[PDB]
Design a protein around this ligand. Structure first.
Ligand SMILES: Cc1ccc(C(=O)N(CCCN)[C@@H](c2nc3cc(Cl)ccc3c(=O)n2Cc2ccccc2)C(C)C)cc1
Ligand SMILES: Nc1ncnc2c1ncn2[C@@H]1O[C@H](COP(=O)(O)OP(=O)(O)O)[C@@H](O)[C@H]1O
Ligand SMILES: [Cl-]
Ligand SMILES: [Cl-]
Ligand SMILES: [Mg+2]
Length: 325
C-alpha cells in the first residue's frame, strides 16, 4: 500500500490580498492535478492521489481520505495521517477545525470540524451500532525544539517533559515515559479532554516563541475491540514546512527520511529526530499512511507552495506494507 498523498488548497486570505498577490495555483479534482504558475507575475503540473479545490468542505476531506482509513482501523491496522505545509496554509484547520461562531451547532454537527472531532464521534457511533465491547484511549504528545510534552494530562504542569527510549521487545517501537493515555467514556467526554488540552496550549504559546508554528502535534487514538482486535490512529499535525528548504531537527529529519526512502539510498535516519523514531512505522513500514499536503494559492508563497509540492510528489513514491494487529 503506497503512502496516499493528497493536496489541499485553501482560499485566498485577506493577508494575501494585502500583499497584493494574484492566484498562481489551479486545482483539478477530476484529473487530480495541481498546476503552479512559476513563470510570471509558464506552469508546472503535479499528479496526486487527490486534489482538493478552494471549495473543499471539511466533511469532503473526511469522506475521501479519513473514512476509509478509520474503516481500516476497525480491522486493527495501525494508520497515520500527516498534515504537511507552510504555516497558515490550513494544517490545524484540517486536523482540528473550528466551531461556527454565530451558529448553534453542536460540535458533532458543526460543518467546520476538522478530522479529530469527526473521527472521535464516529468511532463511538459506528462501534455502538456494532456494539462489541470497544474501549478507547487517546494520548497527545507535542514535540517542540526536540522536547516531548504531554498535553492531555490535567495533573501535570504544562512545562514538564517526558523521556523517550527505544522500545523493549519492539525495537521499531518507542516508549514515551509518563505519556497519559486517557480513556474516553463518551464523546461528551471527548470535548472536555481536548478542551483542557487547548487551555494548556494557550499557556504554552506564552511559554515558548512561535510555539504554534514550530511545534509538531502527535495525536494518538487506540481502540480496543472484542471478538481480540486492536487499532491505532495517529493524527499528526506537523510544524510549518516553511523552515524546510527545497532550524527544525524533527521536520528536517522527516524530509531526509522521505528523501532516503524515495531515493533508495542505504541509510534512512530514523534515529536522529524524536518524530521519525516515534512515527517510524508511519514511513516505509507496516502502518497504512496518508499525507494531506497544504498550500497557498497566492504568488508570494510560491517558493513555499513549490517546496510543499516537491515533498509530496517525492513522498508519493515511498513503499508501505500495512498489517493487522
Ligand atoms: C467544532 C469545533 C469546535 C471547537 C473547536 C476548538 O476550537 N477546539 C479547541 C476544540 C479542539 N481542541 C483540541 C485541542 C487539542 Cl490539544 C488537540 C485537538 C483538538 C481538537 O481537535 N479540537 C476539535 C474538537 C472539537 C470537538 C470535539 C473534539 C475535538 C476543543 C473545544 C475540543 C474545534 C472544532
Ligand atoms: N480550506 C479553508 N477554508 C477556509 N479557511 C481556511 C482553510 N484552511 C485554513 N483556513 C484558515 O486560515 C488560517 C490558518 O489556518 P491554520 O489551519 O492554523 O494553518 P496552519 O495550522 O497550517 O498554520 C486560519 O484562520 C484558518 O481557519
Ligand atoms: Cl481572510
Ligand atoms: Cl471548510
Ligand atoms: Mg497550526
Amino acid at each position: 500500500k503506497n503512502i496516499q498523498v493528497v493536496v489541499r488548497c485553501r482560499p485566498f486570505n485577506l493577508a494575501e490580498r494585502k500583499a497584493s498577490a494574484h492566484s498562481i495555483v489551479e486545482c483539478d479534482p477530476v484529473r487530480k492535478e495541481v498546476s503552479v504558475r512559476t513563470g510570471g507575475l509558464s506552469r508546472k503540473t503535479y499528479t496526486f492521489d487527490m486534489v482538493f479545490g478552494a471549495s473543499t468542505k471539511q466533511i469532503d476531506v473526511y469522506r475521501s481520505v479519513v473514512c476509509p482509513i478509520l474503516d481500516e482501523v476497525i480491522m486493527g491496522y495501525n494508520c497515520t495521517i500527516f498534515a504537511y505545509g507552510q504555516t497558515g496554509t490550513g494544517k490545524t484547520f484540517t486536523m482540528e477545525g473550528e466551531r461556527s461562531p454565530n451558529e448553534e451547532y453542536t460540535w458533532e454537527e458543526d460543518p467546520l470540524a476538522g478530522i479529530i472531532p469527526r473521527t472521535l464521534h464516529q468511532i463511538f457511533e459506528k462501534l455502538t451500532d456494532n456494539g462489541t465491547e470497544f474501549s478507547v484511549k487517546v494520548s497527545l504528545l507535542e514535540i517542540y525544539n526536540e522536547e516531548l510534552f504531554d498535553l492531555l494530562n490535567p495533573s501535570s504542569d504544562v512545562s514538564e517533559r517526558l523521556q523517550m527510549f527505544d522500545d523493549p521487545r519492539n525495537k521499531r517501537g518507542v516508549i514515551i515515559k509518563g505519556l497519559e493515555e486517557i480513556t474516553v467514556h463518551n464523546k461528551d467526554e471527548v470535548y472536555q479532554i481536548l478542551e483542557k488540552g487547548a487551555a494548556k496550549r494557550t499557556t504554552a504559546a506564552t511559554l515558548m516563541n512561535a510555539y504554534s508554528s514550530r511545534s509538531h502535534s502527535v495525536f494518538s487514538v487506540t481502540i480496543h475491540m472484542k471478538e481480540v482486535k486492536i487499532g491505532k490512529l495517529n493524527l499528526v499535525d506537523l510544524a510549518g514546512s516553511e523552515n524546510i528548504g527545497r532550524i527544525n531537527q524533527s521536520l528536517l529529519t522527516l524530509g531526509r527520511v522521505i528523501t532516503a526512502l524515495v531515493e533508495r539510498t542505504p541509510h534512512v535516519p530514523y534515529r536522529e529526530s524524536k518524530l521519525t523514531r516515534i512515527l517510524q512505522d508511519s514511513l516505509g513500514g507496516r502502518t497504512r499512511t496518508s499525507i494531506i499536503a497544504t498550500i497557498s494559492p497566492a504568488s508570494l508563497n510560491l517558493e513555499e507552495t513549490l517546496s510543499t509540492l516537491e515533498y509530496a510528489h517525492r513522498a508519493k513514491n515511498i513503499l508501505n506494507k500495512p498489517e493487522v494487529n
